[PDB]
Amino acid sequence: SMSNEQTFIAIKPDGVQRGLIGPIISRFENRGFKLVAMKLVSPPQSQLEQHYADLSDKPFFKGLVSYMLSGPICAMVWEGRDVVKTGRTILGATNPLASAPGTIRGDFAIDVGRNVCHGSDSVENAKKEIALWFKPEELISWKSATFDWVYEKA
Amino acid sequence: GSMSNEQTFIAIKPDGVQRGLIGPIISRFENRGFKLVAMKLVSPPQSQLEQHYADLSDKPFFKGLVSYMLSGPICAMVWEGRDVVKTGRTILGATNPLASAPGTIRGDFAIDVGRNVCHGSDSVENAKKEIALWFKPEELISWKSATFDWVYEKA
Amino acid sequence: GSMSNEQTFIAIKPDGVQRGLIGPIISRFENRGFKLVAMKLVSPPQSQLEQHYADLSDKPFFKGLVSYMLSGPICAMVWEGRDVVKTGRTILGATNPLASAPGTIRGDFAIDVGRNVCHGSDSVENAKKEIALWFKPEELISWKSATFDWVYEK
Amino acid sequence: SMSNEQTFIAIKPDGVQRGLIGPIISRFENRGFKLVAMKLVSPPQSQLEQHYADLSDKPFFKGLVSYMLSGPICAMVWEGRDVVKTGRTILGATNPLASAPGTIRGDFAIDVGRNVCHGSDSVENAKKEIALWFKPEELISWKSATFDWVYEKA
Amino acid sequence: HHHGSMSNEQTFIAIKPDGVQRGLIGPIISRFENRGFKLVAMKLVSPPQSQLEQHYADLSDKPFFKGLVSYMLSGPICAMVWEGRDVVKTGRTILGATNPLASAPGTIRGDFAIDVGRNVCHGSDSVENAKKEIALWFKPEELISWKSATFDWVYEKA
Amino acid sequence: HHGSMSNEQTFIAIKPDGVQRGLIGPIISRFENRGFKLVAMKLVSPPQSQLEQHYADLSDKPFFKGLVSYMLSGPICAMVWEGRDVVKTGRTILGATNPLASAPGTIRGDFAIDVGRNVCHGSDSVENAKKEIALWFKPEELISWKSATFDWVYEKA
Ligand SMILES: Nc1ccn([C@@H]2O[C@H](COP(=O)(O)OP(=O)(O)O)[C@@H](O)[C@H]2O)c(=O)n1
């Protein structure tokens, strides 16, 4: 709907280890989405447990958290029209076995537990994840020189 | 059967030109095996754009669509190859980028349907009409690709 | 999609070699996380190609298919990884490029089904047969990728 | 050095035949130069003889004219600060064997007689070549949305 | 010439507002990633003028000082720290000559930039100025400690 | 000086670090895009005796045993490329042997840092290419074919 919608995109430790930061950022940049926050971070366990709160009563929660502590994460906020849903489509199916070539996971990933990246699955979950991973001051307000060539309206 | 000398009209719209997508879009068609037979950077007159979009003349956003298509240069192209009309449309991706797939031009580069960076003919007969509208017949260059027999098994 | 040591046979056909697509095709499998365990440029004899296409021996186009595959070099490969047979075919795209999706090898590079740039084994059992036909066993190279544990969940 | 300097860049028939139109355009696009005219053409022999009139006594002249007639040419006018000199640097040394990897000829070409592209060698020669290859109404006046991010001033 | 020999050398690389505006974050990061260098800190930031004036303290006697600061205020900056052998000097070589007119195709500025006042990126010019810039642009806890899985394939020695 | 024979051949190897770091495709593409013709290729883990022969000129050096041990530590993508001046131009494409001295735009200037992890090898002379080609490949593994675009890459035979 509105061009100022925001989503949380994270490059997971395997994506960082495998040297996929540049290519993944380029996918969103090239689409016309606007990077409004980014940091390389190794978040505390409590923050990862909150991010994965929906999985805390599911099997093998401890192992997920330990894996996500095992390397740096490139955390990002991207902004644009339908960026939540379109970002998920750019990432590709969450399990790379089901993803399409031309998406991030369809180009770079094989195992669902090593699926390179995360994207918010809804507008409301995006707002929650952005608040969890970023201080408000870390969200940078700016206007792209090509805004009116990417968008026909606000 | 489909013949390898089918032609389609592909245009890079002003937003495509402004956002520096000329090279990447041409590469998509080149790499697939299609043959560039005509190309020109053009700022066509309003009357030609209104003819191109005559199917939409009675819509209210017509005046604004034509105004946007006048707002910058256009890279007009004719591409030739087997099923190039249909496959060209697939390469561009869904007309509305919201519905397009990553790996297509719009799925890689575009967001808004009104800023969908390119155009492709939607049928062989519409391609013929668009080619006659945007090009003089002498602007179509006859030539044979050195790899024709490696792209095509017949025709 | 079971064991991470599944193997498939991928060949770049004469038209793929002629059109300079060796690099790009290898990069697609490399970038996905699959492991190259065998490779050679080869112009195999007619009898090998007839054996490769043995399941088509009673089709009328058999002789013409064999003759075309003799018309230039072939880059023969074995790739290894989880679900590499089926995912490999997905990466190649639909056998007929007219039905293939942009983002796949054929959806990016090919038009005619008889000039579809590449081949990949269609089943695990056919992959084992094709690997045994195109490579000597000592041509399969045993090695472990430095990023194995970032591509695959332990 | 004004930012409205213009140069003539042509992709020669070998560049067209070998599928290098896209990549060569991207090199100039990516650098920040502005495409102001472009057409695919098969110019008459007279125009090519005028284009290479200074070499009309050189031995490779008539063979050059014949090869320049042997396929389409992608003729272009590019605009920007020091675009004549920097454009030649982007093309690389006239003889590709003396050119640097990272230039067009250093990435794509081998023989000086098959060196993929032409670029004007001086501001005055650019003006002459633009007048020879283009009608003035084929040069398109426009303003790049990122002009103020490519240039500090005009 | 002389090159560094310590694999834990660090440099500060910034993508300037024009590089962010022109969509070059991904390509520039890929250049350093592809070379084998390790990203140890990164953030998108619009720093205050006081920090930019400190960043350019070595140029505070130059006539272009004020304009340089004002320009760096004009949009977001992708600030980064990269780690690896000779990363200060090799990082500058990857960026290319500071003035893009003098830069070579195949470098960042040789591929992407024209005007020195819009030269897309910055790299520390010395080991000591890298130390200063790293500490100026990043809080100490924003430097991330990790070990690249391919370290022993990028480097032959410690 | 540059070679003038279009059937010159050189030996290019992607070293174990090039293979490990996923550079086979990009490296092949550099030579493919330049117009050179691939006439032989195989993934190989050669025996120590062959690597010792390949580095015969360094058998006296103190790092010889370690250099051999490292070249044994992973697979190698061995190739023969054919074209005009392919030996010298091939080395230029690879970049300076020490990546620290190489230029961005070359293979080592894009991908490598340490001279002992410089991702690839190219023959340093026409004669050493002939020797390396014969050392790394059986004669029947060199493939005879004619590129569809030969006459567009080359102005003369
Ligand atoms: N030994 C030589 C030297 C020059 N040439 C010519 O030098 C040209 C270089 O391209 P160009 O004329 O469009 O550009 P410049 O000569 O201004 O660098 C070749 O394409 C040929 O026109 C040749 O064919 N053989």
Kindly give the count of domains of chain A. Answer: 1
Q: What structural class is derived from the secondary structure elements of chain A?
A: alpha+beta
Number of continuous helical runs of chain A? 8
Q: Record the strand order, biggest sheet of chain A.
A: 2-3-1-4
Which ligands, by name, code or SMILES, are bound?
A: cytidine-5'-diphosphate
What portion of residues of chain A is helical? 25-40%
Sum up the overall morphology of chain A in one term.
globular
Oligomer: homohexamer
Largest sheet of chain A: 4 strands, antiparallel
Largest interface (CB within 8 Å) is between:
A-E, 30 and 30 residues
Defining traits:
homohexamer; 154 residues; alpha+beta; four-stranded antiparallel beta sheet; 8 helices; 39% helix; 16% strand; globular; binds cytidine-5'-diphosphate; transferase; Nucleoside diphosphate kinase; phosphotransferase
Structure characterization notes:
The structure is a homohexamer. With 154 residues, chain A is an alpha+beta fold. Helices cover 39% and strands 16% of the residues of chain A. Chain A has one domain (1-154). The A-E interface holds A 16-19, 21-27, 29-30, 35-42, 71-72, 74, 138, 140-142, 144-145 and E 20-23, 25-31, 33-34, 39-46, 75-76, 78, 142, 144-146, 148-149. Residues 60, 64, 94, 112-113, 115, 118, 121 of chain D line the site of cytidine-5'-diphosphate (CDP).
Compact description:
The structure is a homohexamer. With 154 residues, chain A is an alpha+beta fold.
